[PDB]
Amino acid sequence: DALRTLIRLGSLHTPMVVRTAATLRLVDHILAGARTVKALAARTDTRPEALLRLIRHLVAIGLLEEDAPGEFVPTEVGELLADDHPAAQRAWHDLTQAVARADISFTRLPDAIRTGRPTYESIYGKPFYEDLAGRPDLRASFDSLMTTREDTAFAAPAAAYDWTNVRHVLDVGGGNGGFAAAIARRAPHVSATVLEMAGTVDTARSYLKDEGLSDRVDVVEGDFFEPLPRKADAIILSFVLLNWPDHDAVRILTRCAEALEPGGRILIHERDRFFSTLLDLRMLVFLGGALRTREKWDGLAASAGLVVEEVRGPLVSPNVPLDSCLLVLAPA
Amino acid sequence: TVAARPQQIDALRTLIRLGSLHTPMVVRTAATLRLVDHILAGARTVKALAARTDTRPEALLRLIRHLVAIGLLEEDAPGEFVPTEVGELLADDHPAAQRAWHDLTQAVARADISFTRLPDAIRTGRPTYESIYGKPFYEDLAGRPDLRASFDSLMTTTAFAAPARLDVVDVVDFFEPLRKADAIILSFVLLNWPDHDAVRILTRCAEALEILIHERDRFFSTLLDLRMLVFLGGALRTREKWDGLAASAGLVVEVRLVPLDSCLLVLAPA
Ligand SMILES: CC[C@@]1(O)C[C@H](O)c2c(cc3c(c2O)C(=O)c2c(O)cccc2C3=O)[C@H]1C(=O)OC
Ligand SMILES: Nc1ncnc2c1ncn2[C@@H]1O[C@H](CSCC[C@H](N)C(=O)O)[C@@H](O)[C@H]1O
Ligand SMILES: Nc1ncnc2c1ncn2[C@@H]1O[C@H](CSCC[C@H](N)C(=O)O)[C@@H](O)[C@H]1O
């Protein structure tokens, strides 16, 4: 059982069988009628001999089942690869989309452990966010992926804070505007600014406009290593700082400290050890970032001239197998 | 607001485990760095292990976290990590040679990178190995003597072999005219080849006879077969496919065994 258990752990073919299936929209095509190999091969544009060899392992791991002879149907776990499923797992495993494409960086993990440095650029030619800035399909795909992680609703992180005395929110690296939008639905008196990159600002405005939230949340295109576009009572950093090594993280925290109004707060929204280490090693090979322990957080806070006032407890979100925290940061 | 449904979370966790590239690459990185050997040699602190492996200590520790999470390393004493029961199989002296199997510097774990382009293999039926490394699998080994050495040594667990009433006394391209013999042995050979190369090999064997093929949970049958797709364009084959191949070579199957089970197909001239 040890030799068997280690070979399953060490197996590279099972993950890429799952990822090949997601990229081919296999489960979509089955659910739309193509239950046999010959029909599925034509829908996916694959060699019929080759599909069957892929399907065999899909059956052997319990994502596919055989109902009638020759006819394949997804199981309960395999249904999560339907494109419309609310956890978006198909797109998370779609090698044409930005995250599963970034996971190829894991094939150079030894380099990342030897150096502490990301392996993405050594595969694709440019660092992560610079690659997206020249690949609008990947920029859009990454933004859509980050939004679905809270059912695009971000209800749990926005409930974890009291917005009574907050006039303006600046969502720094706020993505497509989901967190800003969630605060505005909860606190009708607050207005908000989303600071994001080229490409993402457009999809953020569309999303915010399509929420009827255009009158209350606006979107600025800029670089958060530079002076922030305005001041605010609540500055949001939501899955931003784990993208960055300690020195860049402090730089970002400092720009936010400079932009705080008197009495205002910086809010860090960030993080099953299997899933904790997945995100942490992703940050290594993608970007050179990391997850940080509470003690490391005090250290980074102090380098930016801030204190961790409190850490508001597990926020459970749908579609994410992993909880998160909200860190409230006070100027020292 | 949020609705958390445990049956769907359990299902989501299952699919993400199945789909994750980090667990296999963490095991392969550990095997490539000889982590378990170094631990067994008395390096239990992260600082020593990083020195022996020439990795940054912060990064090594994050690798260890996942090795702990998946059960290959137990923490035991604060800051001193030890192999578990499963972890001990990464020891270099272990007879299953799993460490050599997962070492990215050896031939097979290096070839396993071909799995990163599985869609190309499924779309086309052609191997992806030469698209990543530049040479088809065996051309690559012919120009890389340490990889030809690693593979030959992996397979025990041509001139580049010879440890020392036929099997293709010791004697040195079975695509060339082969001595003769009363039984020729093709053991885990023909799965390495497309159907036409397999027929060629079987043909030469037929021309020297006065033929037994030794080849084949399903997770391990599909691993070997999908490896043969992305590495070489070979495949595991069914009784029906073996008959069509025997016929193309002038032969007839006259199909006989206990991680993976094997079979014996004795072939006679038609
Ligand atoms: C561990 C059990 C076993 O060794 C059983 C069997 O012996 C076998 C395996 C692997 C390979 C070959 C085998 O024959 C093989 O022939 C081959 C080849 O010709 C050319 C390239 C790679 C391989 C290759 O990776 C192993 C397996 O099936 O699962 C890991
Ligand atoms: N230099 C920079 N200036 C502004 N935004 C940046 C930036 N570098 C990265 N970002 C943005 O930081 C974001 C991190 S992903 C986090 C998105 C969103 N806040 C959420 O929680 O879902 C990306 O969308 C990226 O565009
Ligand atoms: N054109 C060729 N002629 C002869 N041998 C070849 C070949 N191409 C590959 N091989 C060898 O065939 C082997 C398949 S694996 C070993 C097969 C079996 N154990 C045996 O004893 O023969 C590999 O070691 C590979 O080096």
Residue numbers in the entry:
A (entry chain A): 15 to 285, 296 to 356
B (entry chain B): 6 to 162, 166 to 172, 181, 184 to 186, 231 to 234, 237 to 242, 244 to 275, 280 to 285, ...
Please share excerpts from the published article on this structure.
Tailoring steps catalyzed by SAM methyltransferase-like proteins have yielded particular insight into evolution of anthracyclines and generation of structural diversity. DnrK is a canonical S-adenosyl-L-methionine (SAM)-dependent methyltransferase that catalyzes 4-O-methylation in daunorubicin biosynthesis. Recent studies have uncovered that DnrK is bifunctional and catalyzes additional 10-decarboxylation as a moonlighting activity. Here we have taken advantage of the natural diversity of anthracycline methyltransferases and employed extensive chimeragenesis to probe factors that govern catalysis and substrate recognition.
Next the chimeric pair DnrK RTTD and DnrK RTTR was constructed to examine the influence of the sugar-binding regions R2 and R3 from TamK, an enzyme with higher affinity towards 4 than RdmB. Both DnrK RTTD and DnrK RTTR became exceptional generalist enzymes, with the ability to use any of the substrates to catalyze reactions, yielding all potential products albeit at different yields. The presence of R1 from RdmB in both chimeras shifted the reactivity from 4-O-methylation towards 10-hydroxylation, with less than 15% of the native DnrK activity measured, compared to almost 60% 10-hydroxylation conversion. Structures of DnrK RTTD and DnrK RTTR in complex with 1 revealed the molecular basis for the expanded substrate specificity. Regions R2 and R3 are observed in a closer interaction with each other when compared with all structures in complex with 2, closing the active site to stabilize the smaller aglycone substrate. The mutations introduced by chimeragenesis have altered the hydrogen bonding network between the R2 and R3 interface. The α11 helix hosting R3 is extended by a single turn, which positions the helix in the space vacated by the absent carbohydrate unit. This structural change allows stabilization of the substrate via hydrogen bonding interactions between R163 and the 6-hydroxyl group of 1. As an example, DnrK RTTD and RTTR differ only in one amino acid, K190 and N190, respectively, that is located in R4. The same inter-region interaction (3.5 Å) may be observed in DnrK RTTD in complex with 1, but the hydrogen bond is not present in DnrK RTTR in complex with 1 due to the shorter side chain of N190 (5.6 Å).
